[PDB]
Design a protein around this ligand. Sequence first.
Ligand SMILES: O=C(O)C[C@H]1C=CC(=O)O1
Ligand SMILES: O=C(O)C[C@H]1C=CC(=O)O1
Ligand SMILES: O=C(O)C[C@H]1C=CC(=O)O1
Ligand SMILES: O=C(O)C[C@H]1C=CC(=O)O1
Ligand SMILES: [Mg+2]
Ligand SMILES: [Mg+2]
Ligand SMILES: [Mg+2]
Ligand SMILES: [Mg+2]
Lengths: 371, 371, 371, 371
Amino acid sequence: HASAIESIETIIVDLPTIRPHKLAMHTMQNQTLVLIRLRCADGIEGLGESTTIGGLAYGNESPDSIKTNIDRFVAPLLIGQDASNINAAMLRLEQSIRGNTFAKSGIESALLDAQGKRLGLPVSELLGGRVRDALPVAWTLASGDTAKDIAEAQKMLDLRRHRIFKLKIGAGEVDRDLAHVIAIKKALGDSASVRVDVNQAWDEAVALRACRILGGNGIDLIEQPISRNNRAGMVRLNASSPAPIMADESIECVEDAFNLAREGAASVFALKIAKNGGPRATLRTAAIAEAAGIGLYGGTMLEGGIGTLASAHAFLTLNKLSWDTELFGPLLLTEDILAEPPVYRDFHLHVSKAPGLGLSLDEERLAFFRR
Amino acid sequence: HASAIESIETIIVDLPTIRPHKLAMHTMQNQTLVLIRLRCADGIEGLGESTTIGGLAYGNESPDSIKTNIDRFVAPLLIGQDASNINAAMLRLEQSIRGNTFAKSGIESALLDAQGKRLGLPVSELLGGRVRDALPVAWTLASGDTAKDIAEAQKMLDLRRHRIFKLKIGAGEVDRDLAHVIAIKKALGDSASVRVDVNQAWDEAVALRACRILGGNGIDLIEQPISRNNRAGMVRLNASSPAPIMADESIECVEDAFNLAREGAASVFALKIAKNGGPRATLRTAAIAEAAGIGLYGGTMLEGGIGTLASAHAFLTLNKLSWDTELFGPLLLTEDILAEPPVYRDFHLHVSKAPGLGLSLDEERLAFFRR
Amino acid sequence: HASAIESIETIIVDLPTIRPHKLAMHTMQNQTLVLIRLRCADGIEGLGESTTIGGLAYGNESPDSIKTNIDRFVAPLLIGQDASNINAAMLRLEQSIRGNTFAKSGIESALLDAQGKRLGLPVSELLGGRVRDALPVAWTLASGDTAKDIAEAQKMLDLRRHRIFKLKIGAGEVDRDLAHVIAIKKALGDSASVRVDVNQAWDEAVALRACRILGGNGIDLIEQPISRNNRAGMVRLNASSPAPIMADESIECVEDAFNLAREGAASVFALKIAKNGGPRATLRTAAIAEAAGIGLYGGTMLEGGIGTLASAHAFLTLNKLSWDTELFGPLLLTEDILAEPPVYRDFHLHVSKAPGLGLSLDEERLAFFRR
Amino acid sequence: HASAIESIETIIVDLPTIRPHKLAMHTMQNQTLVLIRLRCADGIEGLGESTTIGGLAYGNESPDSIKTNIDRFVAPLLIGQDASNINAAMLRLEQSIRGNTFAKSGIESALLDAQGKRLGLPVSELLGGRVRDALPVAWTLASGDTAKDIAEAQKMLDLRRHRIFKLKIGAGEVDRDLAHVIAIKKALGDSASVRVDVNQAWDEAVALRACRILGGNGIDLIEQPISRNNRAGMVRLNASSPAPIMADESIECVEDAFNLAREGAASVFALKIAKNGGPRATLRTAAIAEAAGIGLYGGTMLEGGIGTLASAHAFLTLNKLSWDTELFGPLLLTEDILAEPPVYRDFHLHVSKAPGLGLSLDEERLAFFRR
Ligand SMILES: O=C(O)C[C@H]1C=CC(=O)O1
Ligand SMILES: O=C(O)C[C@H]1C=CC(=O)O1
Ligand SMILES: O=C(O)C[C@H]1C=CC(=O)O1
Ligand SMILES: O=C(O)C[C@H]1C=CC(=O)O1
Ligand SMILES: [Mg+2]
Ligand SMILES: [Mg+2]
Ligand SMILES: [Mg+2]
Ligand SMILES: [Mg+2]
């Protein structure tokens, strides 16, 4: 085919971050991305990104294993295939490859980028058409210090950078974590929306009490308070919690979205291209949530500009994202591999109408930071 | 915008059929279509079709009211809008217009046709990319006579036209309808798949027995045996019936698909663009079904070539249609408004790769049959 | 520590098989194992095995990615740790590594082997004590030809090798697969137990009928007929099926076992060390099943002698394995890396009381077949 | 066998306590233990303990009937059996003896002690390996006087003996018991965790109100508020109670643990070797709880040092005991039969790495207190 895939190169890139990022299960000291360079017979190159958090501390795919599986199994299946038929290409992978959603997400992102350049259309238009040009972007406070977090949030407000804050908790004693969250919301008052993410850290026995306290203290959303494995517990917590509960880790594929909606495990779903298998699969998960009356949140696995924009282009097509987005990955990185970073201003991420993902590689940064 | 919608004309067309088509609630003596001609500033015209069965005997929208609502409410909302952004256009309609899925389906079909011509791509590619070029097509036997039906099916087999037969029942006494179906399957044996559609005609009290008899006599699928209103009954029948049950009328929007899947009301879903609001909405319903492990069937409201191809292009992108399709509408019509009819041969409908819906109007037929 | 782990080497070994093995999603032409060589400060070496089927066609871990993740993440965490405290070592991995059960299984197997040699006890005794010395072993028929399968089963009976047969179906047309299974059971009659494994291939719409037919034709067990994602469907099938349903792919961790038991998704559970994270985790899954009144089956991912014996030693401690085992992996391989193969005779696998896994490496075979 | 069991002697020992211990159904004025002395052919003696509370006021086994059933049924089954294969020995008992979990617990404890001495390993290592050397120990306040309880708790805090307090209620008027608990928590404030145990005393009609009041007054956990027989009620209370509910009496075997988890009867499970049938069975119950996302608590039936250490060794292997333990039995006894008592300091019980249960009998105390 004139648009046959000729090569797929995966590159692991280690990039510095602006500060330690403390999650319940892991403390980030930097970030590692897997860049995908997909080249086609018509001379077009598509760029994609597969990124996770903390090696294997978050999910079963590491940047290392993502490269291994793409090089050994994905490339052989796609090289020679028509790059202009994305649905057929991704279904070809689906029939021979189980799981590996992070790898698939990066691959589809690259195909979409190339197809966008091929047709001279931004990805958002390839996916149906945008209904907005900007997306609201929350900011995560996870320094591990209450005083530092409050100061940081106040500055982001003054800079008109962020007005929605996500607090990482679950690593310490429940009451200390609760006091921490309450103190932050008290300091910010009505000037900002404060939410929390427990990253599955709590047992239902703890969550049933903690959610009541948070809801009674101005916390707007409680993300994945308990293990995705306590299916019945998540359903019960949705009933006892006065604050809405959002599912994140509970979604590891489109089918999980349906089952969670069927069971009533959460009233809001985080949408992550890495967890669903790319922008298109993520839109199917969004369709399921919408059909069930479940709110949407534009999630991230802390991707750099490529993965962030791939996510953004899909979100631009959604009717509504009631709970906004957390597409701040590029801002946590002190250095990224894009020639021009995404545009952030006035509490939003602004997406252009340039072809594909509307970005280009910074060859110097790639050369220095690639492993 | 360069692709602004300049006009939308709705035309009611009354066309002759090859023979009376007897459904449980109505007997068709002909067919009426609503043609949509959408013209854009860049000189491109998109064609769409909104068609139903028996006036108001099947659904709440008649060809007459579809024209009324499109002319009075849809056109005012779309004229002047960018035709190249289909998602924004359909969402604009969704925010101001409740229901009217048949009208919406015709409108989106026209927009897709125009966009396909605009980019020089068939609709199937606009929707992501085809994974097949042909679709298996079933045939409905509904003459009202057992001997006639058997003869007709045998001929369709000999002509290599159809090998899957759908039998319309529910208008007569249950046992007489059952004998009718059993006699047909007995005569055809393993040379064909025989299924039935009761069009909601039976009460659960009757269906619980009838489904057992049909399943025990070689009937492969039982379509909408009871009222969509007996929600609990459909769930119970899925358990007592040895033959799979398919939901059709139970789906009147994407959200219904989710609720039916949540409740376990059917193991197979019929996919109709008219019932969901167009090809794109139908793909969302398909995504929900797939995520729930529910089989897919390419349904029809007996549309002519335009509506049939709009449906076909969407179905070409589905990973699998386990229960095939019933896209035979153009074959039931003795006359259609296409210059070249869809290609049917060797038990399938063959879809080309021509731009848009790959069709053109027969001006002479349109002029003579338009109301 | 005196028993500190000094090194962990992972070796990918490609071995020939006796014949093509056709599963619903993949056709095996050979087999690849990941050998784990764990050496301790006290001069003891423990051997473990992490093996899967068809690259990524079966699960999300490939032999390639298993090596990548063990070398990059597991080794760093364990080197220097006390090898004699297996629970602490495996929990150390669990707190930093998500998923990767296949890798974990191989690691724990190696630790158990080393600990057995260290104490001069077979693994079965380290795990509590055996209650049997032999395990019944089924045989899978998957040549893709009915005549060939019947002949093969008859020979295994005559050789007193196997009397329980597992038939792989789901790749072809349902009725053809059903005829295939029925013909085999008809030919063998009461001389053997015939079961099937659909490897998630069927939709519930198909399974609800197929299970009835199989149960009515002498088929003793139906393994994973539908997708693990159709949670509600598996529960419904357990009620409509006259033949017991066994969960396999539905179990990807110990927690899944609990949820399946809670929901009533299957009446029998396959026990696979690779799917649970090693012999010890598998015994926890067995404990859950037993507590729920669910039958046990000793499963396999087609491991060679090392993985097969690691599985066997755990199964020797179970009170009862009502549905026997399928520990025939070493028999499907024309060549393995053990100096002395496991002992198979009179329909059983016979496990010795030698220290650890009671095996040693064949250096010549390892050298020739290692990648 | 070289390690054949040659004799099993059961000895009832009546020991003085430090003060009356008032439970909802009984007031303890002393404590009675059943010591098990199991001697093997290799000259090794294993010690075990089967102890309950208040004769038959708590459970169906009394110290008297435990001795009767062990002497008449257990001994005959085990004498002559290989003591080094604990799993086979306990399964041999399970196939011929129904219930009698207290007796079984003492027997397995003795076998583990002997096996530990045989291999020169502490029981915790026989069970897989410890992940901690110390266990947090709560203290029960049950003098029947509010002023006395507050003073006692304050002293235990000052002595760095205990900082978690369990209050026995249910014997008096609900409001008086509630005032009692609230006054104690008020006096201790944040310096201690206060929990209650109602020992099944309340009717659901009372519990639904009382749990709300306790949860709203700083009470951290509510143990078995109602009858284990009101299965549906326990499930309902888990939803209405703002404080987590723990199941104790509801667990009388491993299977009960599964059923309670399936039904959602409690969010925390008390782990008692006497109620499950020994350390090993208790670890299976813990595995079920963990798989269900249910918190763990190290429970006691007020055993002396032998039974307390048997429990402790098992708990040392658990990944996490979110709700700590109540292994204070030896502290309630003014006299025990151990030559050296367990080590309690700085809010914890410290377990050594000595072989077996790491203890020896005080021949003088045994001689004087044995019945
Ligand atoms: O929250 C997660 O699970 C992943 C990621 C999203 C933002 C962030 O701070 O971490
Ligand atoms: O069956 C329906 O409900 C509508 C239509 C589909 C084919 C047919 O014969 O009628
Ligand atoms: O059946 C599976 O899923 C895996 C494996 C077990 C035996 C066999 O033939 O394949
Ligand atoms: O609470 C029980 O049911 C039994 C025991 C545990 C400690 C205590 O004080 O009594
Ligand atoms: Mg999260
Ligand atoms: Mg119908
Ligand atoms: Mg299987
Ligand atoms: Mg209690």
